[PDB]
């Protein structure tokens, strides 16, 4: 199954805000690939202000580093990834949505599919 | 000067009639005054708060189909996308 994760990583280190998101992506990608998975995209969204002052665990956030990860993995490991995301202080919000592959093996992320690039092959041409 | 509402600006290169120089024309203009109105699936914009913040109110209430003018399918998809965006910490 193809899945699209959209994480909202915290940025406490002001001088290098991307520092957290990089190691988040590294951890999740390592898990996926070591569990017979594949990572198709790690599309970075930017630093953005959250709509509200969201309180993950016992610390309040007003902004976060948004990032998207498109990855092919099985249901069990996808649940495991969601579990690790939900119990990580670094992550404020997380969400994994399926991308249906009944038509096409190759499919771009939601952002590129919205821009018009239906599959990764268009995105690389 | 006069209020711009009470006056009519005839565009450039357009044909006109004497009727156009009248309050009837302005009144008739008042009475007879996009991305989702297309093949695009609104459910692909669930991670794009800027696009689908156009189809909500200042307080965030999804606009009725009478307002958005979308098809029933695209109204349903847009509402689903907006709710999903609200859930995933965007919006």
């Amino acid at each position: 199954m193809l899945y699209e994760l959209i994480g909202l990583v915290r940025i406490t280190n002001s001088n290098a805000p991307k520092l957290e998101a990089k190691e988040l992506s590294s951890t999740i990608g390592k898990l996926i690939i070591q569990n017979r998975g594949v990572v198709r995209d790690i599309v970075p969204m930017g630093i953005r202000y959250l709509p509200k002052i969201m309180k993950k665990d016992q610390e309040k956030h007003f902004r976060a580093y948004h990032f998207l990860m498109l990855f092919d993995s099985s249901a069990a490991v996808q649940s495991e990834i969601l579990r690790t995301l939900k119990k990580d202080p670094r992550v404020i919000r997380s969400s994994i949505v399926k991308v249906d592959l009944d038509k096409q093996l190759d499919r771009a992320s939601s952002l590129h599919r919205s821009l018009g690039k239906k599959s990764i092959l268009e995105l690389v041409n | 000067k006069i209020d711009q509402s009470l006056s009519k600006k005839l565009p450039k290169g357009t044909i006109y009639d004497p009727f156009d120089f009248s309050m009837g024309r302005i009144h008739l203009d008042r009475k007879y005054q996009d991305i989702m109105k297309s093949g695009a699936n609104p459910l692909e914009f669930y991670a794009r708060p800027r696009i689908l913040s156009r189809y909500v109110t200042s307080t965030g209430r999804i606009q009725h189909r009478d307002i958005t003018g979308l098809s029933a399918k695209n109204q349903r998809r847009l509402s689903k996308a907006i709710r999903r965006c609200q859930a995933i910490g965007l919006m």
């Binding site: 990608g29 790690i42 952002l111 | -």
Partner: peptide
Amino acid sequence: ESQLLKKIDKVFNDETEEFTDA
């Protein structure tokens, strides 16, 4: 892990065109 490392470095560290949506 090698491809993961290459992509993570290039995609994040470089002043790359992000999908900031504005």
